[PDB]
Every structure is written in C-alpha cells, then in structure tokens.
Ligand binder design. Structure first.
Ligand SMILES: *[C@@H]1O[C@H](CO)[C@@H](O[C@@H]2O[C@H](CO)[C@@H](O[C@@H]3O[C@H](CO[C@H]4O[C@H](CO)[C@@H](O)[C@H](O)[C@@H]4O)[C@@H](O)[C@H](O[C@H]4O[C@H](CO)[C@@H](O)[C@H](O)[C@@H]4O)[C@@H]3O)[C@H](O)[C@H]2NC(C)=O)[C@H](O)[C@H]1NC(C)=O
Ligand SMILES: *[C@@H]1O[C@H](CO)[C@@H](O[C@@H]2O[C@H](CO)[C@@H](O[C@@H]3O[C@H](CO)[C@@H](O)[C@H](O[C@H]4O[C@H](CO)[C@@H](O)[C@H](O)[C@@H]4O)[C@@H]3O)[C@H](O)[C@H]2NC(C)=O)[C@H](O)[C@H]1NC(C)=O
Ligand SMILES: *[C@@H]1O[C@H](CO)[C@@H](O[C@@H]2O[C@H](CO)[C@@H](O[C@@H]3O[C@H](CO[C@H]4O[C@H](CO)[C@@H](O)[C@H](O)[C@@H]4O)[C@@H](O)[C@H](O)[C@@H]3O)[C@H](O)[C@H]2NC(C)=O)[C@H](O)[C@H]1NC(C)=O
Ligand SMILES: *[C@@H]1O[C@H](CO)[C@@H](O[C@@H]2O[C@H](CO)[C@@H](O[C@@H]3O[C@H](CO)[C@@H](O)[C@H](O)[C@@H]3O)[C@H](O)[C@H]2NC(C)=O)[C@H](O)[C@H]1NC(C)=O
Ligand SMILES: *[C@@H]1O[C@H](CO)[C@@H](O[C@@H]2O[C@H](CO)[C@@H](O[C@@H]3O[C@H](CO)[C@@H](O)[C@H](O)[C@@H]3O)[C@H](O)[C@H]2NC(C)=O)[C@H](O)[C@H]1NC(C)=O
Ligand SMILES: *[C@@H]1O[C@H](CO)[C@@H](O[C@@H]2O[C@H](CO)[C@@H](O[C@@H]3O[C@H](CO)[C@@H](O)[C@H](O)[C@@H]3O)[C@H](O)[C@H]2NC(C)=O)[C@H](O)[C@H]1NC(C)=O
Ligand SMILES: *[C@@H]1O[C@H](CO)[C@@H](O[C@@H]2O[C@H](CO)[C@@H](O[C@@H]3O[C@H](CO)[C@@H](O)[C@H](O)[C@@H]3O)[C@H](O)[C@H]2NC(C)=O)[C@H](O)[C@H]1NC(C)=O
Ligand SMILES: *[C@@H]1O[C@H](CO)[C@@H](O[C@@H]2O[C@H](CO)[C@@H](O[C@@H]3O[C@H](CO)[C@@H](O)[C@H](O)[C@@H]3O)[C@H](O)[C@H]2NC(C)=O)[C@H](O)[C@H]1NC(C)=O
Ligand SMILES: *[C@@H]1O[C@H](CO)[C@@H](O[C@@H]2O[C@H](CO)[C@@H](O[C@@H]3O[C@H](CO)[C@@H](O)[C@H](O)[C@@H]3O)[C@H](O)[C@H]2NC(C)=O)[C@H](O)[C@H]1NC(C)=O
Ligand SMILES: *[C@@H]1O[C@H](CO)[C@@H](O[C@@H]2O[C@H](CO)[C@@H](O[C@@H]3O[C@H](CO)[C@@H](O)[C@H](O)[C@@H]3O)[C@H](O)[C@H]2NC(C)=O)[C@H](O)[C@H]1NC(C)=O
Ligand SMILES: *[C@@H]1O[C@H](CO)[C@@H](O[C@@H]2O[C@H](CO)[C@@H](O)[C@H](O)[C@H]2NC(C)=O)[C@H](O)[C@H]1NC(C)=O
Ligand SMILES: *[C@@H]1O[C@H](CO)[C@@H](O[C@@H]2O[C@H](CO)[C@@H](O)[C@H](O)[C@H]2NC(C)=O)[C@H](O)[C@H]1NC(C)=O
Ligand SMILES: *[C@@H]1O[C@H](CO)[C@@H](O)[C@H](O)[C@H]1NC(C)=O
Length: 637
C-alpha cells in the first residue's frame, strides 16, 4: 500500500506492450497491438518491435483477424536487453546460439494462437512480431499472460523504502521487482534443456537457432524462487544468500523461498552433502554452495520464526554442518578440494571465502542450537569457529595490502572472501574491518566494484556482500556511493532493462560475463543481485531482525548523509517501520514501530536524549544505546 507508485509490477496479468519501438516494412496501425485501437495489418515481409517498458514474463497469444494465404506465418521473438532485438531470433538461454522465434502458422484462419506454458518466456522487455511471408495478415492483439509470481498479488507489497535519494528508491524497487520475476510456476523450470548437448565449446551460426521449452517441475508447490527468470529457471543455494532477505523485506513471498529450500534439502546425500543446484542440474560437489544451503535454512527460520520447519529440518542441518566440518584439518581451516563456486576461479586450499562462510554458518548453528535447547553440538562448534578466526587471520591476513589473500600461496585478494570475512566477523577488530572496507573501495572502477577472483568481472552478487561489509564497518556513505556507482549503472544503462538487475558484467562496462561465451545468455533479472533492497531496509533504515520473526530486534539506522528515510516490512508478528529526518548530521525527527510482545535494543550512534513510547514510557540513551525496549511505537525526544 505505501509508496505503491514505485512498484514496477504490472497491474494486470493480461498485458499488451506499452509502445511501438520500431517498424519495418508496410505495417498498418502497429500501435493497435498496444491497445490504442483498431487492428494491425502486416503487408508482406515486415516486423514490429514493441517495448513493454519493464521486464515481463509469460505466455504469448496471437489474435489473428485475417490471413490472405494458407502459408502465412507470424513469429514472435523476445529479448531482455535491447541490444539483442531481432526479427530472426530471441536472446540466448543456452550455452551457445540464439533461441528460435515462436512461429504460428496463422494461414488457417481467425482465432487465438498459443502454445501455452510449455514455451513460457521467462524474461523479456522487447517483443518483435514478424511476418516472413508475402501474405497480408491483420492482427487484433498480441498479448502476454504474465506468469511470473503466479500465486500472489503482484502490487500488494508488505515492505517499502523511500529516501530523499530517488536513485536509491528506484534501486530498492527494481530489486523487489527482480525477485518477483524470479518466482516462477514450478512446472515451467529448467531453461537449460540442452545441458550435455550444447556446451560453450560450440558455434551456432546466424541462420541456426536453439529450440527451447519450459516443462521440468523443479520443486513442489505452486511457486518457487529461481536464479534467473529467463535462465536457468533452476534453484541455486548461493543466490538465496542474497535473495531471501530482499524477498523478506519487500514481497514477503517466503513460500517460494521455502519450496526452493525444501527441494534442495531433498537432495542431501547420506553423508550430509547438500547439492550445488536443484534438479536436473549435474550432481556436483561444491563446498560453498552446501554452506549456502545451511545459511539459507538459518535465514528462513530467522525471518519466518517457523519452529515446526526448523524442527523438521534440524537433523539435516546438523548433518550438513558435520559434512562441512569434515573438511577442517590440523591447521584449523577447511581445506577445500572442490573448485565449484559462484562461477569464480581458484576455489581450493585454505580459501578465505569458504572459511568465512563456515564461520558464519557455525555461529548460525550455535544460535539455532540454543533456540532448540540442543546443547550437545555447541562445544565443538564454538571451538572450531574460534580456530578458524585465530588461524585465518594468521595465515591469510596481508597486513601490507589491508586485505585477506585468497589462500596461503597467492597474492590475489578476492572481493568475496574479504566481504564475507567482514560480514561474518572474522576480523579481530573493528579497525581491521574498516581497513578492509577502505581497501575494497580503493579498487572501484568506472562501472562498480571488481571481483578479481573471476577476472575482469563485476558481480552484483558479491556487491551485495560488499555493501553489507561497508555498513558493518561503519561506512554508510561508502555503501551508498557503491550503490550509486554500480546499481545506477545497472538500472540506467540503455542496454539494461530499467526494471530488473543483471547477473554480472565486465569492468570495462561491457555486458560480457567471463564464464559465458554466448553473451546474449547473460540474464538481466537475477535475484542474487538484489542486495540493495535488504541493505537499504536493514542498514540505512536500521530495522534488523535479530530473533525469530523479529521476536528480538535491533534498531541501528546508519543514515549517512541522507536527509529523509522511511522503510518498513512485516512478519507474522506484526509491523516493523522506521522513519527519520536529518539535517546537518543530526536527527530532526526519528520514530520506529516494532511488533507487540517483542523486545529489542537501539543503537543510534552519537545521539543523546530520550526515547518516548506511545504509553509514555521514557528511556534515556546511554552512548546512543538502549536495551530491553518493549515492542510498540517509539519516538526520539
Ligand atoms: C518437455 O518437452 C520436450 C519436448 O521439447 C519433451 O521431450 C520429448 O519427450 C518425448 C517423450 O514424450 C521423447 O520421446 C520421443 O517419443 C517418440 C514417440 O516414441 C514412442 O513413445 C511411446 C513410448 O511408450 C510409444 O508407445 C509410442 O508409440 C511412440 O511411438 C519417439 O518417436 C522419439 O524418437 C526420438 O528419440 C530421440 C532421443 O530421445 C530424439 O532426440 C528424436 O527426436 C527422436 O525422434 C522419442 O523417443 C522425445 O525424445 C523428447 N524430445 C525432445 C526434443 O526432447 C519432454 O518429454 C517434455 N517433458 C515433460 C515433462 O513434459
Ligand atoms: C589459491 O588462490 C589462487 C588465486 O585464486 C589460486 O590460483 C588460481 O587457480 C585457478 C585454478 O584453481 C586458476 O584458474 C585457471 O587458471 C589458468 C591459468 O593458470 C587458466 O588457464 C584457467 O582458465 C581456463 O580453464 C578453466 C578450467 O580449468 C576454465 O573454466 C576457463 O574458462 C579457461 O578455459 C583458469 O582460469 C586461476 O587463474 C588462479 N589464479 C590466478 C590469479 O591465476 C590457487 O589455485 C589457489 N590454491 C589452490 C590450491 O587452489
Ligand atoms: C494465465 O496465468 C495465470 C498465472 O499468472 C494462471 O492462473 C494461475 O493458475 C494456477 C493453476 O494453473 C494457479 O495456481 C494454483 O494456486 C493454488 C493456490 O492459490 C490459492 O492461494 C493463493 C495464496 O492465498 C491465492 O493467491 C490464490 O488466488 C488461490 O486462492 C493451488 O492450490 C493450486 O493447486 C494451483 O497451484 C494460480 O494461482 C493462477 N494465477 C493467479 C494469478 O491466480 C492462468 O491459469 C493462466 N491462463 C492461461 C490460459 O495460461
Ligand atoms: C529492421 O528491424 C531490425 C530489428 O529486428 C532493425 O535493427 C537491426 O536488427 C538486426 C537483427 O535483426 C541487427 O543485426 C544484428 O546486429 C547485432 C548487433 O546489434 C549483431 O550482433 C548480429 O550479428 C546482427 O548483425 C542490425 O544490426 C540492426 N540494425 C540497427 C541499425 O539497429 C533494423 O534497423 C530494421 N530495419 C529498418 C530499415 O528499420
Ligand atoms: C516463414 O517462417 C516459417 C516458420 O519458420 C517457415 O515454416 C517452416 O519452413 C520450413 C522451410 O524452411 C519448413 O521445412 C522444414 O525444414 C526443416 C529444416 O529447416 C526440416 O527439418 C523439416 O522437415 C521441414 O522440411 C518447415 O516445415 C516450416 N515449419 C512450419 C512450422 O510450418 C516458413 O517456410 C517461412 N516462410 C517464408 C516465406 O519465409
Ligand atoms: C513433488 O514434485 C515431484 C516432482 O518434482 C513429484 O514426483 C513426480 O511425479 C511424477 C508423476 O508420477 C513423475 O513423472 C512420471 O510419471 C510417469 C507417468 O506414467 C511415471 O511412469 C513415472 O514413473 C513418473 O512417475 C516424476 O518423475 C516425479 N518427479 C521426479 C523428480 O521423479 C511429486 O509427486 C510432487 N509431490 C509430492 C512429493 O508431494
Ligand atoms: C569437531 O570439529 C572438528 C574440526 O575442528 C572436526 O574434526 C575433523 O573431523 C573430520 C571427520 O571426518 C576429519 O576428517 C577425516 O580426517 C582423517 C585424517 O585424520 C581422514 O582419514 C578422513 O578420511 C577424514 O577426512 C578431520 O581430519 C578432523 N579435523 C580435526 C582438526 O580434528 C570434528 O569432526 C568435529 N567433531 C566431531 C565429533 O565430528
Ligand atoms: C567480533 O569479533 C570480535 C573480535 O574479533 C569480538 O570482540 C572480542 O570478543 C572476545 C570475546 O568473545 C574478546 O576476547 C576476550 O574475551 C574474554 C571473555 O571471554 C575476556 O576475558 C578477554 O579479556 C578478551 O576480551 C576480545 O577482546 C574482543 N575483541 C574486541 C576487539 O572487542 C566481537 O565480540 C565480535 N562481534 C560479534 C557481533 O560477534
Ligand atoms: C557525508 O557527510 C560527511 C560530513 O560532512 C562527510 O565528511 C566526513 O565527515 C566526518 C565527520 O566530520 C569526518 O570524520 C573525520 O574524522 C577523523 C578522525 O581522525 C578526523 O581526522 C577528520 O578531521 C574528520 O573529523 C570525515 O573525514 C569526513 N570525510 C570526508 C571525505 O570529508 C562525508 O564525506 C560525506 N560522504 C558523502 C559520500 O557525501
Ligand atoms: C526508466 O524508468 C524510469 C523510472 O520509471 C523512467 O523515468 C521516469 O520516472 C518518473 C518517476 O521516477 C516518471 O515520472 C512521471 O512522469 C509522468 C509523465 O507523464 C508524469 O505524468 C508523472 O506525474 C510522473 O512525473 C516517468 O514516467 C518516467 N518515465 C518513463 C518514460 O517511464 C525512464 O523514463 C525509463 N526509461 C525507459 C527508456 O524506459
Ligand atoms: C588439501 O587436500 C588436498 C587433497 O587431499 C591435498 O593435496 C595433496 O597434497 C599432497 C601433499 O600432501 C600432494 O602430494 C598431492 O598431489 C595432493 N593431491 C590432491 C588431489 O590435491 C593437500 O595437501 C591438502 N592440504 C592440506 C594443508 O592438508
Ligand atoms: C589497524 O590495524 C592495522 C593492522 O592491520 C594497522 O595498520 C598497519 O600498521 C602496521 C604497523 O606496523 C603497518 O606495518 C601496516 O602496513 C598497517 N596496515 C595497513 C593496512 O595500513 C593500523 O595502524 C590500525 N589502526 C588503529 C587505529 O589501530
Ligand atoms: C499493539 O501495539 C499497538 C501500537 O502499535 C497498540 O495500539 C495495541 O494496543 C497493542 N496491542 C496489544 C495487545 O498490546
């Protein structure tokens, strides 16, 4: 309800394109297919590329009025980015080649032509209607059944964010909408229908095209969160380590997260190994992604407060923790023998990123075990955790460059490892964390923060963890600067979609993703690139869930130089909201709402005064902090 005007999601599921972008050949009244009136008559070989304004998804229907020849055809091509607009092909989903247009033999007669959900286009902003025959074809409409997020009201958000910075607001809502697009009907999964047949080492020529379909049921239930709407349309655990919290503070569609998580845990091996991806992707060993599955279960319990779910899955979670701990060696660090990660290079040995994620997982597991009163596993865990810290900063810390090396035998400093080490509290001091934040920011290029472990690549995925690291190191304006630089490029570059966020690109500002050779296959709607949504709600607005469903919370707004911030979301316990206005580095007004029955703490920084409750309770701030605050509405006096 609040700030609904920023919500990108369509107001219906019956969608005509918004505007005509380009016309080729004799075409009468192309604007008719935008709902502007009349019918559109294609006279011979012709085409019209239409623009929807935003990235959309679903099932195309061609309403034909007449066709002069029995051999007439109408084709439809789709593309996320405008650089792959073509009257001959879509953009790519497979490892090599462009996808074939959807061809309708409309030479029969009048009626609506469709091939249903088997050929759902998972994501596209531009749609080209093509007549490749000398026939005259009149069409009444070409519309889309919008099938992204199938069991929800697309414009009924439970979270919101609005600041004095309009770019930040648009970035928040673009992340939320991206997540909506990646929630699919589970019966239309697996866009990689050519896995095994089409590989990177191949060439599909200009007249050659890839066939595509969507008919693998990837989860149970009626909705699930995938990595990318166009592609892979599969469940990936690492992507959830950014996507879950951004879903939780905007749409609250944690049911799709839950189906994805359950499908992943259903693939656990007897020894506890969790999968690299959901079915039918290759059974692959990946340390880090197994740990991401553990992270995801922990965060799901944190936001839903589902005791029954955690109880169902605690045995599997402990088995996974045991599997990961089996990699720890005499050193006290995990020695990673699997190279598979987020499509980066050099995963192995005493990798800083793997061990930081392990530290994070261990602390998650201890807090969960205390929630469940399962004290037995705690000891080992604590000890192991300590060792990681103690050894990771002795054998991996580079004091001269202010960052962690990737392992013991390299001078490379990975962005993911250092970001995660700050996010997991692997550093021995806040001063260290500030060094890491400063040194990461020192590496920014004209198009955002680099990930040297994956070559000349910018990763919005790792950008989300770096944002969190800048925040936890006490640098909110550094984080807002990275937001502006990287995500304003992702949102406002004319090749982007202006609604959804890219999977990754290159440091020179090109849309080359190094792991892929088929550049049209990069997805422009990946949930793992939506870090700013959760970051702006949690850190800028200061609404931090610290207990199940917000049973306990921390209010720590890190405003920086923003002069006005409003944000809010809900859990099954009630409403969280934060609202403040500043000027000259001081709060003019500050208020926040937390659900009843909850208790929390406050941390405003260098702020002195009283917090007044709705009833009238007054609490003095000591060092900008206060604890034991009872749930409700609070204002700063
Ligand atoms: C998702 O969509 C894809 C299509 O894009 C489907 O893939 C096809 O699935 C069919 C199964 O339905 C595959 O099998 C083909 O069946 C044809 C019929 O053969 C007999 O099948 C029954 C079996 O009991 C007989 O009783 C009956 O009399 C039929 O005669 C065969 O003619 C096909 O031969 C094909 O074999 C090779 C290897 O598979 C193919 O590559 C060739 O095209 C060749 O013609 C075949 O056996 C078919 O192969 C699949 N095709 C493709 C392109 O993948 C998925 O099934 C569908 N999945 C879901 C869940 O909906
Ligand atoms: C400790 O950390 C360092 C730094 O990350 C790490 O060195 C990295 O090792 C990986 C291999 O695990 C290297 O990745 C390969 O490097 C070679 C060049 O030496 C390239 O030719 C490779 O590219 C081709 O091959 C890949 C498959 O093998 C394909 O995926 C790829 O598309 C190419 O076809 C590949 O990049 C990485 O380059 C180095 N790091 C640097 C800076 O070169 C080291 O391995 C870690 N220690 C241990 C024990 O793993
Ligand atoms: C065009 O696209 C539409 C989707 O965008 C299609 O409508 C969808 O049809 C499916 C079934 O084929 C529905 O999925 C069902 O979901 C219910 C649960 O939903 C109920 O609860 C939720 C949450 O409270 C609520 O939002 C719903 O309104 C329901 O009350 C399951 O129990 C079923 O087993 C089944 O999975 C989708 O809900 C429905 N979409 C919408 C928006 O309602 C439509 O059929 C497509 N048509 C064509 C011709 O392609
Ligand atoms: C007729 O419509 C097309 C769009 O379908 C207009 O743009 C042209 O589209 C073709 C593809 O059908 C482009 O060719 C391709 O270009 C990309 C790079 O952009 C390249 O990677 C491919 O290998 C292929 O060469 C073509 O460049 C593009 N032209 C322009 C100027 O954008 C076309 O302009 C329309 N014709 C008229 C007369 O309006
Ligand atoms: C306009 O586009 C439609 C759809 O692409 C064309 O229909 C297809 O035309 C081909 C001829 O190139 C028909 O022949 C088929 O060729 C494939 C190999 O490419 C072969 O494996 C098949 O056995 C068959 O011989 C194809 O059946 C036909 N497809 C459909 C669904 O009708 C149409 O010819 C184009 N017309 C013009 C004037 O460009
Ligand atoms: C949860 O989803 C899974 C699929 O992810 C459901 O199990 C699936 O059941 C279908 C329908 O039986 C299987 O398809 C095949 O059907 C033919 C029909 O003749 C049959 O001969 C095959 O033996 C097979 O049953 C499909 O293979 C199977 N999925 C997998 C991954 O094997 C399940 O029913 C859903 N609901 C739950 C678990 O409550
Ligand atoms: C408590 O955490 C520690 C980590 O500090 C766990 O220790 C590790 O346990 C695994 C179990 O598989 C050991 O791996 C095994 O190593 C032997 C060689 O010693 C090898 O032959 C096996 O194939 C397997 O790889 C690992 O070495 C060990 N590391 C250390 C430093 O003890 C321990 O498992 C956890 N507690 C429990 C009860 O599991
Ligand atoms: C993040 O990690 C830092 C250290 O990297 C944590 O602060 C550190 O807390 C430990 C205790 O957990 C302190 O070590 C010792 O604690 C014993 C009591 O068990 C005490 O008797 C010793 O005098 C010593 O304090 C350590 O000094 C302290 N370091 C700093 C710089 O504060 C911090 O608590 C962690 N933060 C989170 C949110 O987990
Ligand atoms: C956002 O606004 C602030 C305030 O105008 C910008 O400047 C930063 O302000 C703080 C507080 O005055 C400076 O703190 C420094 O502390 C060290 C401690 O030793 C002291 O030596 C300095 O004299 C100063 O008091 C901080 O250096 C300063 N930073 C800069 C670059 O001016 C801040 O830059 C603004 N950020 C953005 C992105 O707009
Ligand atoms: C990419 O998306 C942005 C944001 O949606 C577009 O910028 C413009 O953004 C503002 C809202 O931030 C919209 O303002 C409205 O303009 C209408 C014009 O009639 C006015 O009546 C309203 O009161 C309000 O001021 C504006 O519509 C929007 N422009 C468009 C074209 O959507 C940006 O233009 C988008 N670019 C592309 C190429 O899609
Ligand atoms: C980490 O594990 C790997 C795999 O078990 C170890 O790699 C082997 O190291 C030995 C020396 O101990 C070499 O002779 C082998 O060639 C290596 N094999 C493989 C498959 O990597 C590595 O030594 C382990 N590192 C630590 C510190 O325990
Ligand atoms: C924060 O800790 C770092 C060490 O990680 C201190 O900076 C280092 O100081 C040593 C002094 O011997 C130098 O050799 C290193 O080059 C410095 N490292 C970096 C990255 O600058 C720093 O002084 C500490 N700051 C505070 C306030 O305690
Ligand atoms: C819940 O909190 C609201 C204030 O936000 C208050 O009006 C209401 O009475 C509270 N209900 C209970 C049962 O405490």
């Amino acid at each position: 309800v609040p700030y609904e005007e920023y919500i990108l999601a369509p107001s219906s599921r019956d969608l005509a394109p918004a505007s005509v972008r380009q016309v080729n050949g004799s075409v009468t009244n192309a604007a008719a297919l935008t709902g502007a009136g009349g019918q559109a008559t294609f006279n011979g070989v012709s085409s019209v590329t239409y623009d929807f304004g935003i990235n959309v998804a679903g099932i195309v229907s061609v309403d034909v009025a007449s066709a002069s020849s029995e051999s007439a055809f109408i084709g439809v091509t789709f593309t996320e980015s405008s650089m792959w607009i073509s009257n001959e092909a879509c953009d790519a989903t497979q490892d090599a080649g462009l996808d074939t247009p959807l061809w309708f033999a409309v030479g029969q007669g009048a009626g609506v032509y469709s091939v249903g959900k088997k050929y759902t286009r998972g994501a596209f902003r531009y749609m080209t209607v093509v007549s490749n025959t000398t026939a005259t074809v009149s069409l009444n409409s070409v519309k889309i059944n919008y099938t992204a997020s199938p069991i929800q009201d697309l414009r009924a958000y439970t979270g919101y964010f609005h600041s004095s910075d309009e770019l930040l607001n648009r970035i928040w809502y673009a992340g939320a909408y991206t997540l909506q697009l990646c929630s699919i009907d589970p019966t239309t999964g697996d866009a990689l229908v050519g896995l095994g047949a089409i590989t990177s080492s191949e060439t599909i020529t200009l007249p050659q095209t890839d066939k595509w379909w969507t008919n693998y049921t990837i989860t149970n239930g009626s909705s699930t969160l995938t990595d990318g709407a166009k592609r892979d349309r599969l469940v990936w655990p690492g992507d959830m380590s950014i996507a879950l919290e951004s879903v939780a503070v905007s749409t609250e569609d944690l049911y799709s997260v839950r189906t994805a998580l359950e499908s992943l845990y259903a693939l656990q091996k007897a020894d506890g190994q969790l999968p690299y991806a959901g079915k039918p992707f290759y059974d692959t060993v990946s340390f880090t992604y197994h740990l991401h599955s553990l992270v995801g279960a922990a965060s799901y319990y944190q936001y839903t407060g589902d005791r029954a779910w955690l109880t169902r899955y605690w045995g599997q979670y402990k088995k996974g923790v045991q599997w990961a701990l089996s990699g720890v060696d005499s050193t006290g660090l995990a020695n990673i023998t699997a190279s598979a990660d987020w499509l980066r290079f050099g995963m192995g040995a005493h990798n800083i990123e793997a061990n930081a994620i392990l530290y994070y997982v261990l602390n998650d597991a201890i807090s969960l075990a205390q929630s469940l009163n399962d004290n037995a596993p705690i000891r080992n865990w604590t000890a192991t955790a300590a060792r990681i810290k103690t050894v990771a900063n002795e054998l991996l810390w580079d004091d001269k460059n202010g960052l962690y090396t990737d392992n013991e035998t390299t001078t490379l400093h990975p962005q993911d490892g250092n970001s995660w080490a700050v996010k997991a509290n692997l550093t021995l001091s806040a001063n260290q964390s500030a060094i890491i934040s400063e040194s990461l920011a020192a590496r920014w290029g004209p198009y955002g923060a680099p990930a040297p472990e994956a070559g000349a690549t910018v990763s919005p995925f790792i950008g989300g963890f770096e944002l969190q690291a800048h925040y936890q190191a006490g640098q909110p304006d550094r984080a807002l600067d990275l937001l502006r630089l990287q995500w304003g490029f992702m949102l406002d570059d004319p090749r982007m979609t202006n609604s959804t966020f890219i999977e990754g690109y290159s440091t020179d500002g090109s849309l080359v993703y190094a792991p892929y050779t088929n550049r049209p296959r990069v997805s422009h709607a990946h949930g793992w690139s939506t870090g700013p949504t959760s970051a702006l709600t949690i850190y800028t607005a200061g609404l931090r869930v610290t207990g199940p469903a917000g049973a306990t919370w921390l209010y720590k707004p890190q405003p920086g130089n923003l002069t006005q911030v409003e944000a809010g979301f809900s859990t099954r316990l009630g409403s969280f909201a934060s609202s403040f206005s500043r000027s000259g580095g001081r709060y003019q007004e500050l208020s926040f709402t937390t659900p009843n029955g909850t208790t929390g703490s406050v941390e405003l920084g260098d702020v002195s005064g009283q917090l007044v409750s709705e009833g009238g309770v007054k609490v003095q701030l000591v060092g900008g902090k206060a604890s034991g605050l009872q749930g409700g509405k609070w204002r700063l006096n």
